[PDB]
Design a protein around this nucleic acid. Structure first.
Ligand SMILES: [Mg+2]
Ligand SMILES: [Mg+2]
Ligand SMILES: [Mg+2]
Ligand SMILES: [Mg+2]
Ligand SMILES: [Mg+2]
Ligand SMILES: [Mg+2]
Ligand SMILES: [Mg+2]
Ligand SMILES: [Mg+2]
Ligand SMILES: [Mg+2]
Ligand SMILES: [Mg+2]
Ligand SMILES: [Mg+2]
Ligand SMILES: [Mg+2]
Ligand SMILES: [Mg+2]
Ligand SMILES: [Mg+2]
Ligand SMILES: [Mg+2]
Ligand SMILES: [Mg+2]
Ligand SMILES: [Mg+2]
Ligand SMILES: [Mg+2]
Ligand SMILES: [Mg+2]
Ligand SMILES: [Mg+2]
Ligand SMILES: [Mg+2]
Ligand SMILES: [Mg+2]
Ligand SMILES: [Mg+2]
Ligand SMILES: [Mg+2]
Ligand SMILES: [Mg+2]
Ligand SMILES: [Mg+2]
Ligand SMILES: [Mg+2]
Ligand SMILES: [Mg+2]
Ligand SMILES: [Mg+2]
Ligand SMILES: [Mg+2]
Ligand SMILES: [Mg+2]
Ligand SMILES: [Mg+2]
Lengths: 106, 171, 51, 61, 199, 192, 98
RNA sequence: ACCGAACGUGAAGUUAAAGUGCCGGAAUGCACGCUCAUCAGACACCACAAAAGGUGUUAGUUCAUCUAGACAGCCGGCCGAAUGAACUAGCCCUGAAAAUGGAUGGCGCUCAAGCGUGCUACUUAUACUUCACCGUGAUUGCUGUUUUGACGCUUUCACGAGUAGGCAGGCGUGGAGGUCAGUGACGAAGCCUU
RNA sequence: UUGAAAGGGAAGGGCUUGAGAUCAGACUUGGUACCGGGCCAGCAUCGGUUUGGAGCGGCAGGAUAAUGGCGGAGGAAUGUGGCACGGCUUCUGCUGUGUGUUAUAGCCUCUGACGAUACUGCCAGCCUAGACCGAGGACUGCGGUUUUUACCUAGGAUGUUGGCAUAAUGAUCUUAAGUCGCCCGUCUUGAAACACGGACCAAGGA
């Protein structure tokens, strides 16, 4: 009862980019404990939440969310590409996201 | 490269003068049959008044290893070009396949003489049946009786970036 | 207005090629061949092994 | 990119209408646009093209 | 692969640039890293060779005003810090925050003397260098180029190791007693079931 | 389908018979080739540029079927540094025509989505179906010219899996240009 | 296209309700529900018309009776059903069997 | 100015040339060797180095001595098993000296993150594939239902870089003929303004 | 001046999102507790494009794979047992050297009848994970199933549920962050140039 987590910990690592040009429409996400594309393919299609705090209350809450989804793997070390409704702000590079266990296929 | 051994057989195009020209065979170590037929014409025009335009490829067949799980020693006779001249050499390799010995040879002359694939002619690959046929010590040292050796300083590959225990190299 | 691939859409495949139905029904893609157990290389074609 | 074997976006180089703003010549072009579009007679297509021609291309007969 | 609150790396026996690149990517990706015992780090190549390299570094200074030029830090932690900062986009705000995520020390000062130190196998000298190659200890290179506190660190390190040995002897004794109690409670119904479950 | 299977079995039988009778069966030289332009449109000398235009290869990844004769072989030799070509199998031809098959109808690129389109343009040549068209291409037929020119040049994608490390050197030397001869099928599987 | 679900309510506090199949992890543990009558339950049962209906409370009790009767047979199954699920530190759902 | 590729506004996929230790997206990837530099080396154009040398190390070529005991060492013996010479070419080293401090791009790298070679995956251009939208050019049809827009509506396909320059279609200003029986002291024109 | 904001050796710009401010909009000119609608989403099924799986099955080819296993014949050594000499062993994997050819281990070559697998192809074979898109707008066509002048996956997205309408949503402005961005005009082969004109603004100006 000390733990209540139903999501996998993730991190916003980068945008999709070449050496000099970045593409904000695709985010690179590191899912915790995933080290290969085979592991990362479990999470394809899963929802992602970026939860953050804001100055103004909206309906009595100062907590806002940007929703996204895992679309494909990236590279060979288990990072995935994510697609959020609104692009994650660049300040969130290194910020933690939540990888939801739904849509479930277990 | 990753190679196969091919039997390529070819001939001059028949003429009304000569209606059955002589058939010539070559053993070619090539990655595929396109390079096998290219190397065939490459050596035939070094050895005969023939061209691909005036010739004909008769047969291309893979030659599989006779005993692919028997450990052998091969002697390979080579003719390679250096930056200054052309040299003949003879080297020895230990392997279970003739192709894998030729692959090791190509890596070895790339490493020791900077000799590229284009600069090498394989004159001959022979399996050395007798232990007395082995001239080179770097392969003769593995033909001694009751050969044992350890592998000191084992390095274990980790799946994680951080390890909570001290590294070890026993083995 | 929209091209449909006959290699994915079975209806378009039958529209273009009516014989695909017979090919599937007759299993032409996995048809066995009846032949004798022979090996014609035992003699001089062993010229491949050495020459 | 494309390796163009001909010049791109080239107008036909033929008149598709009279340069004239005479409404009655436009009515004649209407009548023979309908005839050329619907009669299969080559005469009507020739007449329709000739109604577009300029003054020097219609010398007095 | 877990996200940790702080990763404390024991810097002994680690190759400088390989540890630097790994730590750089860690702090860029939002991980807080502490490196202790930077005086025990290693650089490949003989000591004289690395000392000559540091003197090449010392040669470089702003001609018109030496106070503007590169600032050659002599402490081992600062040598590691220079290696990391060279691998960080330190002139951006993001790189500055990433560098705020990092701490480097000589010795093992509090509070890290009573915490867990890990190693990084991809950067360990004993696992990376061919067993005959020569290497340098950054503590000796630092003393050879101006670092003043080598003997203070080793005096404090001997005191810390004596205290940590008293710790370990107590922990081992309580581990022996707990193991004897787990042996006593073995072959019980719960133990047999946990053995059938793999525990 | 029956004649395809019979021809395959006949060639296999001929090879086995030549093997048995101490002889060597020499295959008939290929009569058809599929040519893919793998080079861009910049910096091409005038003669190979004209040759690629006459082969209707005016963009990268454009493919065309060519019936091999002396004239067409000497054409393809000029364009060799810019193309990858080879001998296409029946399944490769079928996949190309089914997925990316378009006809030139009144100088317009029309999808081959119904046999009436093929009949209205090639019915005077006894081509009434997509399978008739595929057969005419595969077994290089008496109306190969009309059937292959009716086919608009195939516009392939880039390979799924990439090329070799460096395209613009002959396939024999580890590149991509020139004649690869049966590996055109693997390349087309990658690009179509 | 929804799943009918019970806690059972006595064990869990989760009543008879619908869930979506995509917001569910289907474990490998199973209970014999051949003795549970779920004939009267359908979409119109959960129609939108706080106070809970006496029909719904009665159906909850009747279903939970059979569910508990079958649950008692498997040891620790009632405790398992009454305990919440959470991801612990070092739990990898791509490696775990459920 | 080289390599790749040439450009309407977008979505998705894949690539080219170049890369994948960090700066930087992608491997501290798999593999066979070579190299240790008290000025290592590190990728075409290209931003340098030669002749000549080295018992550094590696691999070769050709001669010669060898269990009828080779070379070395103690006085033929003594352990026993290889040895000598010339030559070839890989990497490394010497040859190798300039002026502000400083550049394989930087950090840094030594069974490499260097050099030669092979393989697998992976990264991503305004390029290629499919689709949407804009425009240009061509193209299908439209009058007994043409029907107050035919200089219009509509079907289909292809294409889109641009200085000098040409042409086309439009935006805006002062004044003039006509028209809106137009706006306006109940506020024209002008001016300021997320 | 007041107010707002930002500010480590310039500032300014583009793209993107966050934050704050401003503006907008369907319960419509909604119709009679209900009908139905708008927007944002979840799920299902479809169609177009596409990336995958430690996927599963069938067929073909080759030296009708080469091997391997089994059988036969021959042979050798880095010679097993045995034997004969030895140095250390209460002969305690004892061991070394000779001999010779399976013995108390085995191996190599040729070969005979079977049986597989690798590799490369084919399947108009099967199962399975995800992403982006939904142009069009009565019917007309081509096909398929026909139980049928009917139905379909077949000439381009529908069904259902939830929430919201003081708002989830969108735009702009300011600002931060990431990334890229040299000063325009000109003559010139070549300009950011250590080439020239330009401090600023209005009106005039070919
Ligand atoms: Mg274009
Ligand atoms: Mg890929
Ligand atoms: Mg490449
Ligand atoms: Mg070139
Ligand atoms: Mg990276
Ligand atoms: Mg020299
Ligand atoms: Mg040398
Ligand atoms: Mg040098
Ligand atoms: Mg560089
Ligand atoms: Mg390499
Ligand atoms: Mg793209
Ligand atoms: Mg233009
Ligand atoms: Mg102009
Ligand atoms: Mg005036
Ligand atoms: Mg008035
Ligand atoms: Mg006013
Ligand atoms: Mg200042
Ligand atoms: Mg903004
Ligand atoms: Mg906002
Ligand atoms: Mg689909
Ligand atoms: Mg056999
Ligand atoms: Mg629509
Ligand atoms: Mg910049
Ligand atoms: Mg000027
Ligand atoms: Mg001038
Ligand atoms: Mg000048
Ligand atoms: Mg200028
Ligand atoms: Mg200048
Ligand atoms: Mg001047
Ligand atoms: Mg002047
Ligand atoms: Mg001035
Ligand atoms: Mg003015």
């Amino acid at each position: 009862a000390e733990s209540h987590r139903l999501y996998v910990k993730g991190k916003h690592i980068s945008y999709q980019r070449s050496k000099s040009v970045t593409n904000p429409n695709v985010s690179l996400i590191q899912i915790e404990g995933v080290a290969s594309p085979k592991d990362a393919k479990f999470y394809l299609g899963k929802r992602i939440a970026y939860v953050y705090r804001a100055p103004k209350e909206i309906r009595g809450s100062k907590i806002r969310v940007i929703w996204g989804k895992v679309t494909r793997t990236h590279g060979n070390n288990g990072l995935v590409r994510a697609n959020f409704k609104k692009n994650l702000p660049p300040k969130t590079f290194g910020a933690s996201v939540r990888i939801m266990l739904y849509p479930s296929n277990i | 490269s990753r190679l196969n051994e091919y039997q390529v057989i070819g001939r001059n195009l028949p003429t009304e003068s000569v209606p059955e020209p002589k058939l010539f065979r070559m053993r070619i170590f090539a990655p595929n049959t396109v390079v096998a037929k290219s190397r065939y014409w490459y050596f035939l025009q070094k050895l005969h008044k023939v061209k691909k335009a005036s010739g004909e490829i008769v047969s291309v067949n893979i030659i599989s290893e006779a005993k692919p799980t028997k450990v052998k020693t091969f002697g390979i006779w080579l003719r390679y070009e250096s930056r200054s001249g052309i040299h003949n050499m003879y080297k020895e390799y230990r392997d279970v396949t003739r192709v894998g010995a030729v692959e090791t040879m190509y890596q070895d002359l790339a490493a020791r003489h900077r000799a590229r694939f284009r600069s090498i002619h394989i004159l001959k690959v022979v399996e050395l049946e007798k232990t007395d046929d082995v001239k080179r010590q770097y392969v003769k040292q593995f033909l001694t009786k009751d050969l044992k050796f350890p592998l000191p300083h084992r390095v274990q590959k980790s799946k994680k970036l951080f390890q909570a225990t001290a590294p070890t190299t026993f083995y | 207005v929209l091209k449909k691939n006959p290699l994915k859409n079975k209806q378009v495949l039958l529209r273009l090629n009516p014989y695909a139905k017979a090919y599937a029904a007759e299993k032409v893609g996995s048809a066995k061949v009846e032949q004798a157990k022979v090996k014609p290389s035992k003699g001089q074609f062993a010229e491949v092994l050495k020459n | 990119g494309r390796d163009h074997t001909s010049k791109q976006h080239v107008r036909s180089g033929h008149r598709t209408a009279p340069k004239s703003d005479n409404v009655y010549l436009q009515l004649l072009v209407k009548l023979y646009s309908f005839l050329a579009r619907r009669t299969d007679a080559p005469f009507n297509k020739v007449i329709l093209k000739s109604l577009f021609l300029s003054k020097i291309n219609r010398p007095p007969v | 692969s877990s996200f940790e609150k702080v990763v404390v790396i024991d810097g002994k026996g680690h190759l400088l640039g390989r540890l630097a690149s790994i730590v750089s990517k860690q702090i860029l990706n939002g991980q807080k890293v502490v490196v202790v015992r930077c005086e025990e780090l290693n650089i490949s190549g003989e000591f004289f060779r690395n000392k000559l390299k540091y003197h090449d570094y010392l040669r470089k200074a702003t001609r018109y005003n030496k106070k503007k030029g590169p600032f050659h830090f002599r402490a081992p932690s600062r040598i590691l810090y220079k290696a990391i900062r060279g691998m960080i986009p330190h002139k951006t705000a993001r790189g500055k925050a990433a560098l705020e995520r990092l701490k480097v020390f000589e010795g093992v000062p509090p509070p890290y003397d009573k915490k867990k130190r890990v190693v990084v196998p991809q950067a360990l000298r004993v696992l990376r260098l061919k067993p005959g190659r020569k290497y340098t200890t950054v503590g000796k290179l630092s003393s050879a180029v101006g670092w003043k506190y080598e003997s203070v660190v080793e005096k404090l390190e001997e005191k810390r190791k004596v205290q940590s040995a008293e710790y370990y002897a107590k922990k081992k004794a309580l581990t022996k007693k707990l193991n004897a109690a787990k042996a006593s409670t073995a072959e019980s119904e719960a133990a047999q079931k946990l053995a059938a479950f793999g525990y | 389908q029956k004649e395809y299977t019979e021809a395959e079995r006949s060639v296999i039988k001929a090879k086995r018979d030549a093997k048995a009778s101490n002889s060597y069966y020499v295959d008939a030289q290929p009569k058809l080739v599929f040519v893919v332009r793998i080079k861009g449109i910049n910096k091409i000398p005038p003669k190979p540029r004209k040759v690629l235009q006459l082969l209707r290869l005016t963009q990268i990844n454009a493919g065309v079927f060519v019936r091999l004769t002396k004239a067409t072989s000497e054409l393809i030799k000029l364009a060799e540094p810019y193309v990858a070509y080879g001998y296409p199998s029946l399944s490769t031809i079928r996949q190309l025509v089914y997925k990316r098959g378009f006809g030139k109808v009144n100088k317009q690129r029309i999808a081959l989505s119904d046999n009436a389109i093929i009949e209205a343009n090639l019915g005077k040549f006894n081509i009434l179906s997509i399978e008739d068209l595929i057969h005419e291409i595969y077994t290089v037929g008496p109306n190969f010219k009309q059937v292959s020119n009716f086919l608009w040049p195939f516009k392939l994608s880039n390979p799924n899996g990439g090329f070799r490390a460096r395209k613009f050197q002959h396939f024999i030397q580890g590149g991509d240009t020139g004649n690869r001869e049966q590996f055109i099928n693997a390349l087309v599987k990658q690009m179509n | 296209n929804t799943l009918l679900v019970s806690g059972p309510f006595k064990v869990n506090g989760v009543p008879l309700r619908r869930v979506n199949a995509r917001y569910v992890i289907a474990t490998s543990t199973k209970v014999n529900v051949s003795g549970v009558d779920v004939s009267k339950f359908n979409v119109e049962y959960f129609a939108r018309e706080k106070e809970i209906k006496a029909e719904r409370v009665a159906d909850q009790k009747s279903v939970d009776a059979a569910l508990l009767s079958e649950i008692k047979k498997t040891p620790l199954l009632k405790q398992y059903l009454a305990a919440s699920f959470s991801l612990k530190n070092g739990d990898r759902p791509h490696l775990l069997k459920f």
